[model samples]
Target: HSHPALTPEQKKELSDIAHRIVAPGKGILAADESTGSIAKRLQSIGTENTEENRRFYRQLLLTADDRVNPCIGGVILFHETLYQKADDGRPFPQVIKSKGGVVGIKVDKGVVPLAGTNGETTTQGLDGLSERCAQYKKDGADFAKWRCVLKIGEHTPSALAIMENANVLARYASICQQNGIVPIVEPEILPDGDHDLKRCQYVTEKVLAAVYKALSDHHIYLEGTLLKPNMVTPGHACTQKYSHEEIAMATVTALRRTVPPAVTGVTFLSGGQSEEEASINLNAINKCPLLKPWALTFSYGRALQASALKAWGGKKENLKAAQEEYVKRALANSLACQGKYTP
Candidate 1:
């Protein structure tokens, strides 16, 4: 039951980093899309998915003013972005550091199908993760994100899938700590079905219960880790409607029931929510009058950059406009994390 890996000072250092990332009104910017994923995003806006364009966009966000430090505690990067250079030849990680943000890396290699389980999946990337973690730590990534996906479907997400993904996440977390990288333990339930709010809530509770159990089994240092979860909202095509207040209550209640207080923070994923919806929902979450032991904030990807990417459109002239859009979202989310966003 005891995995005595971190000394008191080591524990303190890791927990401090975790807390700082979720410090008051601050969240994360998830810019760690793989080439394929980012290509899709670029295609949506009819822009070329070239390396320079990607680097340009990444630099724009990383080079934003210090104003974002109070709003953005961390920035997660794709592996390519890790070594990519800013416009002024500064490395991307250095640019983030200059802005008072911790650099994070997406460690997952993407999802692989779980055979005989109705298309369910567990993330792949644990192979050689320890060495990779060490290298990333040296490369200036203080944190790592490995995502595990779960879905709500009839006769799906079998016990096999649940326990498998949970154990994988736990293993990844353990390895990250061993290599001095704080892991963002993400168990994201897809909003891809026609499931209603209650169904989503039920599934979320089950998934989180399994996740925490696995974390314990692995003896992961809870204080050194953060959770990234999906809000308990209905599926995009669901017939039933739920208010933002209802979503907040469902999300917080689930965390209250399952997550341990020792975990440092909870940065919710936007999943497929619109830009406004993600911020509004997160704002509502902070306002929920409950004993929230963890800092609930944003770790958004598309929801944070949809407009910015559109504005950039692979043009040099649009860079400033793109940066403005990103700053606006960061400011919006900063307020949302404090329950103070005004529309």
Candidate 2:
């Protein structure tokens, strides 16, 4: 699909939104895991599964510190958490807004099994997504997210999967813009297999190239869309351990080759990496000697929240301790995003 030509005024408005989202030293906070994903995380930490517990966990992060405002530009939410009130009866969105953070929602239901593929997947929940996006905007969500997963393997992530996922993401972005919501467009290539670093790079290049074309074809404004991408890295099982510089070089090289400079930001997903590792890598990316032309930061989930959640353990009494842990990591990542973090 070819995009309709945009008037200069509309283009300017979109560019402004993108600029605010990726301003220097600011990144996004992704607290948007689904309830099922949260339950799995809870099981890892031996915490009880309850809505209030989940609420407490998130509220702790949202209210971590005003300092987070300088580092974190937005907070992404799951559906239930988006509308849930804090223990003080203030809505969660209110809490984030009070701190000058933009609220975003996860729009995809989840990944669905792809037929006739070797354990591949695609994101679902486009049906009625426009209506849902409008409702979320009315409920104070200023942005939204939808993730599409790709993997590196033999004959995997066929062209069909790449094109289909990209087109779907573009449609989602278009709808979000229509509702005045920014879209964090994610196309994550899994690092679960035994693929080599070069293979991972190749697959990412193909996948992201498709995504950008689809966005352009759909006439979606790139300035209003955030790219939540997987940093180019070897598979988790790969024998090679890449240095921060190596990872930074591969990641920036890939993004420069594919992602247009017109996009708002290129916020990386942690993709199961540890918090420190992710932060170090992001710092390296920002410090890399390349013409980035866009912000190199993070939109991390477990990588940002896992350690803090583990410290909290569902105890209200541990709130301060948990908040401290969260602030530590947020500050680290924030500085890392600006290439100022040391130790």
Candidate 3:
């Protein structure tokens, strides 16, 4: 038996939106941290964990200068941030949309423990997802993000791990499309072990192939999808080292082998690289002589926010300074996505 997939009109609509998001010199702002996640971020800088504070900070990002308008093609929001209003009383999503940027929503609840494996996990929050996507679309979200985290280690991310996660992503993608929401398939390979760059590349290729194969089996329309994979980099604690160019090469080579051309774009996750490090590597990835089939860009979170968070420190008085920090990174990443980043 076969399932119904996207019609030509559906494919065209999705591909157009996906391409716009990863257009030349443009990328996404992943400000979709969960409540708990944002708490940790606030705690790190001695800020109070209050809804108003969160609103204030998010408003700062959504209302940044027009320079960021060209740089940021989209803004991914947590549920709270989506509904929260700017100081001017406009909802954050409206603020984003008014500036010619698309609004995205993170739909995954959080990771669930996968039993009988090496601490492996899968993302949750699928119950009633169709309804949620429909609601989110009407509420101002054009794209949806679901993150499935994979880790590298001995005997970890076994076959069951890969298959379950990929199938779940496919299901999410299917539901999102039914409701006019573009799905960003984010299978993040965390950098936490002592593995070398080569090992990371090896693992990335394996994971992505399984993911696409699952997508095909589920009858997903690749043209409507966006991939957010980790850049091939050594584990954070790896003993071996590689240059940015090498990282770019490994990343592109891995994608070339697995990601189908029909997939609209590849927006790399920062995967814990510092802001400067992420931009340089993205520049190199664009600079890689390899002819890429998909749009190569960034879908960054921490890397885009580290400096801005530091600048804000939850200080109402520092909002301007903090916005400058955010815009600075946005402009840098815009240039980096286009292979024109100088730093």
lDDT of each: 0.88, 0.85, 0.88
At residue 176, candidate 1 shows an lDDT of: 89
**The 10-residue segment with the lowest total lDDT in model 1:** 1-10
TM-score of 3: 0.97
Please give, for residues 89-146, the per-residue lDDT of candidate 2 as tens digits: 8999999888878888887878898888887888888899778887987898888888
For residue 54, model 2's alpha carbon misses the true position, in angstroms, by 0.8
Tens-digit per-residue lDDT, 224-290, candidate 3: 8999998888876787868788888898899999988988888989887788999999999999998
Query: What local lDDT does model 1 show for residue 103?
Result: 95
| 141-218 per-residue lDDT for model 1 (tens digits) | 999998888888898778999999999999999898887788898888988879887878888888899999999888
Which ten contiguous residues of candidate 3 have the minimum total lDDT?
Answer: 1-10
Q: On a 0 to 100 scale, what is the lDDT of residue 258 in model 2?
A: 98
Query: Which regions in candidate 1 have their CA more than 4 angstroms from the true location?
Result: 1-3
Clash statistics: count for each candidate: 0, 0, 0
Give model 2 RMSD, 1 decimal.
1.8
